[PDB]
Amino acid sequence: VAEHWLLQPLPEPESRYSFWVTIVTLLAFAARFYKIWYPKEVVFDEVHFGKFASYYLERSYFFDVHPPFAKMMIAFIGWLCGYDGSFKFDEIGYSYETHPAPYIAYRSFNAILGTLTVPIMFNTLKELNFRAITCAFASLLVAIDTAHVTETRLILLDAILIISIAATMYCYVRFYKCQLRQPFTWSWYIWLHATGLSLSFVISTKYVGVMTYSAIGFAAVVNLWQLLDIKAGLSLRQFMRHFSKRLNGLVLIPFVIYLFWFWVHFTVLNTSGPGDAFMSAEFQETLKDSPLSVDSKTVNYFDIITIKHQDTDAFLHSHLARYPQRYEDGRISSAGQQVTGYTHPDFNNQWEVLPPHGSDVGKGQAVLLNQHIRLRHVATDTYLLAHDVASPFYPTNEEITTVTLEEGDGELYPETLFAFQPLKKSDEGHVLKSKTVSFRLFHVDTSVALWTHNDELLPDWGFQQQEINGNKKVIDPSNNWVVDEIVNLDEVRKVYIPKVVKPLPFLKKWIETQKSMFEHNNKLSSEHPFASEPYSWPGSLSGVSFWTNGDEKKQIYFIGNIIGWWFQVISLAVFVGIIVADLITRHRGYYALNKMTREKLYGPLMFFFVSWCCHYFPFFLMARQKFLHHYLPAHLIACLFSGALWEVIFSDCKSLDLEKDEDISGASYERNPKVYVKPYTVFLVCVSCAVAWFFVYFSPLVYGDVSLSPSEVVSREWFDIELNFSK
Template sequence: MSSLHEQPLRRRGQREADSGTRTANEQQVSVTDTDTDTDKYEHRRETPTSISTQALEAVEQFDFYDRVIALALTFVSLFTRLYQIGKRDIVTWDETHFGKFGAYYVNRTFYHDVHPPLAKMLVGLGEFLSGHNGSFTYASGAVYPEHVNYTFQRGYVAVFGAMTVPLAYRTCRLLGFGKPAATMAASFIVFDNAMCLISRFILLDPPLLCFTAMSLLGYSGFMAQRHRAFEASWWRWLAFTGISLGLVVSSKWTGLFVIALVGLCTIEELLKMFSDSQTPAATQLRHWAARVLCLIVVPIAIYLASFGVHFALLNHRGTGDFKMPSSFQMRQWGNVVGTQPHEVSFGSNVTLRSHLPGFGLLNANGTRRFPDRDREVIAGGVPGKVVNNWWTLVSANRTWENASAPILHVHSGQLVRLAHINTGHFLRTGRSPPYNMGWDRRVFVDGNKTKSDVWDIWRIVVDREESAKSRGKLRAVTTNFRLYNAVSGCLLQATPASFPENVARKFSEVICTDANTTRSEGTLWNIEQVRDTRLKRVALRSAVKRKFLRDFLWINREMAISNNGLTTDPDKYKQAESSPWSWPLLFYPMRMGPWTDDAIKYYEIGNPVLWWASSFCCLVLYPLQLIYWAVQWQRRQISSRWQAGELLRFWDTTKLLWGGWALNYLPFYLMGRVTYLHHYLPALYFALLLLAFEIQCFVHWYMPPRAIWSVAGITILAAAGVFWMFSPLTFGWERPVAELGHLCWLPWWNVVRDQNLF
């Protein structure tokens, strides 16, 4: 069989020399023509529909030499990732975050982070296997104590990064790369300094890259089985793809870009099948069902399961409890919400939590005032537990506000005042508009025990009772209620809008809305804590059954809010942070620690030759190829170097690799959050494979068949040479950086000194 990937075609000049008498019009042929010329480079043509099972087996074949090559590349990859990995015995860069998160799994204390839990649980597993007891806090710049085997922990994570290399080789072979091109592609992964360095610390990126590579491998294997539908091997590759997608999205949300890639390719395949009238409807339905099961249900199940394990492991009070709803907190061992009075009385001191994720607890602070002439003290929401969160439930006529008075339970429909303990003011609304939403009423605190107002009075309306007790009475944690102002009838509502930094830093606005928003979660409240010596403290842990789906949705929304809150710091820009436009050009490499002469210095910089060459392929060469072939296809004139069907096989490979690069890179332009150079690495993985494929195609079109080994060898040596040149900054440089001035290939690289020209 003649294949774009395995059999070289002769050049157009050779065709013209052989034919001699061919006219100008004959030098271009229709895609449906057949060429009868024969020479040593010519082979039988095949149409796209003539791909046989034997041909697919040839593409899939992973012979002895493949195994030797893959094993050798794996050893080299492990060496580059593990060499002197324990050289710096100090908590480096984001190890302070992810090492600490891993320790939380060891001591089982709950925390909050912007990323899904799977990769962090894997980090925690590595710490557990290393013998870590969870006591070390991984403070930034701290020296690792003797009882923390940080070398093992780093090495454990590095293995994930090293495994991307054999995965890349196997993927390329499944995509139809020859052995030289597959070796070249995997070597590019080995000898990229950025991928190597990011794998040498306790971070989430190595598992992310590994699962990204697994996803591409799975889908490539599945596509190679497309003509063996519903056979065992077809199901194995499809299931492996779904599992890999679940793993990658459970590590970081950027895994959604890989899911988008597989999803788009799957939709294209199913639409082609739908347009084929020869495919029975029952068969098409089976194809749809199989993909829904493996590519949608399986990833979702893995994502849900990762949070299930996350919740099960972290069942003790921790730093992230305040981000979760009260019903979740009361089940955490050691959390004060789990042991407190369940009943509530007039005169009780309470905190009020909104059911709007991200809002937190109702708060007031005497130093935060509306910036107008009234200067009222702002009432709003804060995510943490602070002293200004406490309020006293006071009856409307103020006869039951003394904590020593007889117990009088609060019932639905009763009128109350909320007295802020620290300021002594009452929660109040009025006619003035809020800061962010001009069509509603602002909420503030004003007045005192001797100076109250009817605008202070609120009616409590119980929405539902989550415990087994009767509805109608106000209780801590389990009673969800709304607050209506007694004068205007407006509804107290938490909003996601925040005040500016100069008005009320990290303060969410609460309003009183006249709209009918009873279905809004922002209007639902519950009492999170009660302090009242008159009331009996009870264990609330079993008062409400766990609602996993609610906790799952809540934590994911909190993750999204926190992720959007990671904004750019101008002081760090071009020192650590960078914009997406600069990544393919490798404009701003990143220092990963102190840069003094006596420090061990690490520099997150890619292999410049590989980055610039792959960027040229993705940004220039491949788009131009698409434009050229689109024009030629429209004219029904494809260059004679193309055999029938080979353009489609070229498209099948490049759409996957270029699409993977684009989907893992371009969405960062739409993000408002802070971005770093290492965010480009998943896209780079696809770009390096595409680079190797384009090199193979160039040799295939313009050079003799055996030249591919020479070209691959020279290219690999060049990549290895540049890698070695920059390796001091990858393995850790202990001497003065002035000695590395020759590595400033671009004048604004801050290898030696800070110099930002852009």
């Protein structure tokens, strides 16, 4: 693919490329470093990534839905500044003056990466044999894009993502040119492993990096398919050498580097922290106690405990009121004592943990997960019970009640047996601890889990409390409980108690964290006001508010350069039209396009078009929340594509003979199609001036540094762009 085009010498002297790359890099630097100290407050997702940087410096364990590499790079800048992690970035608008985080250093690090993306983009087109002005223009579309500028000056992961994607595209183009010239050279190995390294940084930043693996993977498979052809003149042994080396450089080594970042993450984060609630008790045993205080108090037999629901914050509660003999649907209840979910702490939330009848287990022995227990309600002196009676609201779920001590020590003994069932089978037989160990309150006889909900409350006979029922869907994550407090805790157990750190194998630790990452990422389905669908992204039809100051009437708003984005949409549509027209005309025996024009169209332009498709279309298959920033990888590729496309349109594209296919072996074709440089440069200058005018017009919303009058705010409201201070 594009062998004759990509093996040409550069169309211009290197001094012209060096001139234009310097100019566009200086523009990119100026746009990102402009007022980088402003605002002196926490902006948007700086609340998350600044906070994660602080937890790395404190060595406090935290959970996140994204892989650790980009957060560790941010934390590493804090570490170089001697920052201790004291400031937590808790809310948007928090002043950096009261608690000095090195926010200028963090923002400057991202501004450097955003600036360095531009010369990588330039050099990608240079290596694809495009003119220096074409390389300049495509890189300018990223240098002065309002969305790329806003994101790459704040403490966000996207600066690290976007540079890693740009580096991946560049390294793969370099690898492919080495493959065309001479495979298995030292340079061929360097560029193969550099593509793999860059691909590893992409997926180690965000899981959306799978789209970059898909783009490079497709191009690598297309080239392996050409090398498998008998016409390539390769033996099957030489083909297998290509396959095994690419598999190693593009899959195996990048996967080892991906695992290395998790190994660093778990080695740095060796202290208990806000992430503990997302992990098993066995994982938490690998963490040291915080130098601070931990309420993870061991639960013993004969401890009086409160049991709290994780999703509704309701306590397991009981009182002397009884279920009505019939529910409203005419089903018969036990007329037993009510067990309900109550959101306020009281004496009716108190349950004593008792061992099974005839056990040798005494006072002060720890309760283990998945052991049989009984729960005695302290206020009514009754045992918790579940039975084959249907619950008030759910005909398939069991009513939860209580029984007298005499009856529960008699025939109903099996129906009083519960277990603190662990969420993970790996955690069976671990010591139960308050606040840190989630469990299902599992009934032994009927095999149900205790469950509660807050969408519907019990009628007046149940005091408008939450229903407690025996859910047959035991594995349901909504069946999760925690021991909140131990009411009868001895004074010796109140003071801090050390912990023997137990080792866990790295792969077990990584598999657990990885499952939790994917499960929590798939649960991000709430409604968010700034969520946007893939169809709106190429038009930049809506944006995201990043920061607002009410007193100064200033705001930061995340939006694309609409002139630049629409120019790229037009470019994508024009290219599809050109490819369809070329295919139709060829099928009619009419060969309109020169061989060299086709090598540009079906080589670099098709590579970028398919790469854009890989970063755009998969989002239509995703049911989770999505946002405009998810399109920035696709926009980055669309900038390269649009620059390249318009050079082709302004080239002498005509075949020498419209009746002859120049792709036939031995056909004469024009090897150096003339670019119409004068009209092409005028066209690029006109588009560049329009994109620059838009960037200047929106610059108050990119920087947040200028107060706009309400009429000036409204003049920037179009489509679904809602701005603050329009009134």
